[PDB]
Design a protein around this nucleic acid. Structure first.
Length: 165
RNA sequence: GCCGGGCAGUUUGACUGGGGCGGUACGCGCUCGAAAAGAUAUCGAGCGCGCCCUAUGGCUAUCUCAGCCGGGGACC
């Protein structure tokens, strides 16, 4: 029972692409004093016409979560811009964060996404034992039974703090 | 020392469907030709080397990508 219940594992915020803290190391400042940690990431994909053609990229991305830091964040997080907080918005797996997608090559990849819900929010929902699949060892796979359902997912969060819409 | 075919001795290669012009199959590496051991020709087919690197060498420790999807073409 309690096992079946859905809770949020790692969320992680993120930022847009391009260089960050261009004038001075900034934009990391936001994400700072927000969420508590300070991630930074880099990128690949050299020739960008209006992007850089830098290889190793300063590119801003970051955040993550845990338990309880993203609660008390993802608190006063959701209840931010959500014209349609949920619906079609997230999908089979449980949760999402998106907006309007573009015709781009997708699907055959690990599936990180451009998608921007908020400063592209990533609530990811998983119930269960699930640490099973992720963890290195006999990985195991999710049952596709005890898997999240969007319906269940658009529950839990909604029951608390904010309407589904 | 300089100029110096005025004059003398010579050289000016080989391969090559004759020779010449072109080309080099003139040294060397791979696939195929090559006929399931080995060896095997043509101006046979496809194509390379005459270097570069103080790490792009040596050892040891430790060891996740493309791409796609979802949440905030950079990044998380």
């Amino acid at each position: 029972n309690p096992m079946r219940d859905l809770k949020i594992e790692k969320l992680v915020l993120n930022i847009s692409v391009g260089e960050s803290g261009d004038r001075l190391t900034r934009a990391s400042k936001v994400l700072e004093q927000l969420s508590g940690q300070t991630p930074v990431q880099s990128k690949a994909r050299y020739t960008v016409r209006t992007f850089g053609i830098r290889r190793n990229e300063k590119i801003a991305v970051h955040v993550t979560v845990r338990g309880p830091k993203a609660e008390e964040i993802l608190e006063r997080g959701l209840k931010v811009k959500e014209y349609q907080l949920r619906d079609r918005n997230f999908s089979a797996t449980g949760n999402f964060g998106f907006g309007i997608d573009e015709h781009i090559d997708l699907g055959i990849k690990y599936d990180p996404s451009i998608g921007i819900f908020g400063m592209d929010f990533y609530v990811v929902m998983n119930r269960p034992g699930a640490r099973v699949t992720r963890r290195k060892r006999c990985k195991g796979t999710v049952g596709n039974s005890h898997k999240t359902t969007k319906e269940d997912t658009v529950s839990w969060f909604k029951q608390k703090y904010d309407a589904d819409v």
